[PDB]
Every structure is written in structure tokens, then in C-alpha cells.
């Protein structure tokens, strides 16, 4: 019933932190995303996984990297973490570059394109926009 | 209080 | 023999499909500070869905939101987490 | 004081978004027949999330598809769990 | 940190059996679906629910249902429960006559409009597709 | 097996 966690590591976490947007895509800065990416590496590091920080990664970057990682041999580890710093709209996360689609980051990590993360459990958090609706909140 |  | 290509990922989404989520330039945003003082706290002695579900709670009680507009102010979010696990996450043993 | 009005929310849904579902004509579905038999063995003793990832497991493991049509034959399915649950549910006391 | 269940009652349980559908839709017979609905009943029942079973509904009988439930006093109720059995496609559910989107369904039980359920747990149970694609499986 |  629970995950096997009886390997040599706990596993890698990418956090990708991105702070400054090319002007053309409209986004704003997003201060306050420094503090997030501080107390996510504490954080994720103090619990044994070997984290990683990007900062302000075009839409290639974040793809590519996230494609290199699922490429790397897992066996040694119970699992993967990754955490999404970032402007986003539905389905959508945004590079300094423009956006990209959710799904095609973590889909690298599928059972068939992650063999050594198979039956492991694939983390992703993601902090970002999902669109433009606000919640007024009740009571 | 800003928004993503 | 076979296990779908799709199972054992997790989604914690900091809000819900279509609305918003905050960010206090300050500080850090309500969900990625609130997760992380809740792992603080609890990441090696409960599950992870217990984890967010508690985060789901910090944020939707602790937080209201402040902006001179008066449009974005007064606010609410909650997060959305996504599971296709198999089985109970702890992160020790 | 407030509560955000998406909250408390949970939908268990019998597959993934984009994916297929499966259903077997003299049995039922491969989720719901899932769903059940956790439940009669496992609600009034279980967190909610405990018995759906369990559910989760067993959809993804105990089943196959068999399909006269070779494009449907020997495919998966995995479950989608999503919450924005505030609390643990129990369903009794 | 679990819900209050000190109630009167666990709560109300529909229970949407779409079976046969308007040839308009294209959508064949969904055999197997009445045992579906028929253990679901027994297993809710036993939980305590106060389950009612409707079956071949419209897009407007599944609107109305959910609205009708949405404008109870739940007063004395833990909890909702809503299953939803039908054919469906991405964010959409099958009536017998064509699609309704599922935000549609569930949005009559937002904390605004419905306060007999505020900080209450709103369950959604969904047998359907949801879009075309095949999970191949691995391994 | 069927789809739904």
C-alpha cells in the first residue's frame, strides 16, 4: 500500500524559477518568486532530494531539460519532484519566451519514455495562473 | 497582493 | 505485467483550472509557502495527500487578498491537486 | 471568515483526461466495479483518498483490455483523482 | 483536520444511469452500465447515503437534478454525492439527447450557491471518456 | 471490452 522508498536516494527535484519575461509576451516581473525558490530548495533539500534551480528558462530550456532529466538513469532513486515557478493560463505555463503546454513537460516522464521511473511516483507542483476567473469567496 |  | 504509461504522477496545482493564484512580492506566493511550511512541519511523518490537503486548507483559510484595485481585492483561492498514484507516499523509511 | 467557493470539491473520474474508459458489458466497468469492491471492504474505514488510490492501483494493475478490434486490444487505464478537499473524510462516526 | 460528520444524515446520492441514447448522437447502448449502477446503489446505500437512481436523462433532466439537489436544505447532512454514468467526451457528458459540460453540472454546488453545503465535501464520481487516446500500458 |  505504500511506495517502496528503500532506495539509494530519494530522487532529484528541478525547481525552474521564472522571474523576468521577454517584454513581448506581455507578462510582468514576478517579485516574490525568489522567495518561493529559497524555501522550495530548503525545503525539498532537507528532505533528501537533490535539488536543482533554473532561473528564467525560455520555453526550449524548460523542455529540453526536463526532457534530459527523464533520460537519466532513476533506478537508484524512489522518485522525481519537479516544481513549476511561473506565469501560466489554462494548460499552459509560461517561458521568458512564451508559453508552452503542461502536458508536453511532464510527459517525458511517462511510463514508456521514463523506464527507470516506472511504478515510482512523478511529482510536479506547480505554481501559476490556470486563467483569468477570480474567487469572491464566501460567508 | 499580485497575480500569476 | 503492464502498468499505464499515465499512473503514479501528482499534480499540486496552487489553484483550480480557469481562476487565478497569488503572489505576494514580499513574501512568496500563498500556495509554494504554505506547502512549505506544512513539509516543514510534517513532510517525514504524513502522506502526501494528507500533506496537501492541509496545504488546501491554509490556503483557502489563512489567505484573503489585498490590492488597492479594488477589482482584485478581497480574494479567495483554493488549489487542485491532480493524483494518478497507486499507493500511499510517505517520504521516509 | 471566507471560504473560496471552488473548495471542498472532489471528482473521482474513472480515467484521464484526453484518454479512453473502459466497460465490460457483462460485468460493468473496470472503474466502478473497482470503486465498489474497495468500498465494501474498505468505507467505513478508510480516508477517501486511501480508497480511491487504492482504487487507483487496482484499475491500473487487475485489468487488460480484450477487444475483437486490434486497436482497443491489450490497452490500460489509469484513473484521475482530484481535490480540492479542506480536510480528511471518513465515511462514518 | 478530518470533516464533521456529526450529522442526522450522511447525505443525498444521485445516481445518473444513461444507458440508451437518441440516435441524433451517434452514441450506442452502454451495456454493463446497469450493473454499474446497480452495485453503486448497494455500496453507497451501505455507506449511509440516501441514494436515488435516474436513468436515460436529458441534458436539461441532469441540470435540473443537480440544481433541484443544489437548492435542498442540507442542513443536516455530512455531505453530497453525485455519480455520474454515461458516455463523454473532454470536460463534457452525454445526456441521452447530446453533451452538457460537466463545469455546468458541479457549479450549483459552489460555496455561493449552495450554503447548506458550505465546508462540506461535494463528491463527483464520473464514469466516462474522456477524449480518444489509448494508454498502450508498458513493461 | 467497450468505451465509453
Not at chain 1, 525552474?16 to 524555501?39: H, L, S, Y
Not at chain 1, 527507470?116 to 464566501?138: H, N, S, Y
Request: hydrophobic content about 35%; proline content about 3%; glycine content about 6%.
Amino acid at each position: 500500500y505504500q511506495y517502496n522508498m528503500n532506495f539509494e536516494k530519494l530522487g532529484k527535484c528541478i525547481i525552474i524559477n521564472n522571474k523576468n519575461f521577454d517584454k513581448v509576451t506581455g507578462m510582468g516581473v514576478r517579485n516574490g518568486t525568489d522567495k518561493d525558490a529559497e524555501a522550495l530548495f530548503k525545503c525539498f533539500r532537507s528532505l533528501g532530494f537533490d535539488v536543482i534551480v533554473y532561473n528564467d528558462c525560455s520555453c526550449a530550456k524548460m523542455q529540453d531539460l526536463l526532457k534530459k532529466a527523464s533520460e537519466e538513469d532513476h533506478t537508484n532513486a524512489a522518485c522525481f519532484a519537479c516544481i513549476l515557478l511561473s506565469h501560466g493560463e489554462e494548460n499552459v505555463i509560461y517561458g521568458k519566451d512564451g508559453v508552452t503546454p503542461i502536458k508536453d513537460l511532464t510527459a517525458h516522464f511517462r511510463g514508456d519514455r521514463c523506464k527507470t521511473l516506472l511504478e515510482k511516483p512523478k511529482l510536479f507542483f506547480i505554481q501559476a495562473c490556470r486563467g483569468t476567473e477570480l474567487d469572491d469567496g464566501i460567508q | 497582493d499580485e497575480v500569476x | 505485467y503492464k502498468i499505464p504509461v499515465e499512473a503514479d504522477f501528482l499534480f499540486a496545482y496552487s489553484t483550480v483550472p480557469g481562476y487565478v493564484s497569488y503572489r505576494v512580492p514580499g513574501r512568496g506566493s500563498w500556495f509554494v509557502q504554505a506547502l512549505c511550511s506544512i513539509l516543514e512541519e510534517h513532510g517525514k511523518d504524513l502522506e502526501i495527500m494528507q500533506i496537501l490537503t492541509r496545504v488546501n486548507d491554509r490556503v483557502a483559510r489563512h489567505f484573503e487578498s489585498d490590492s488597492d484595485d479594488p477589482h482584485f481585492h478581497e480574494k479567495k483561492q483554493i488549489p487542485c491537486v491532480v493524483s494518478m498514484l497507486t499507493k500511499e507516499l510517505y517520504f521516509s523509511q
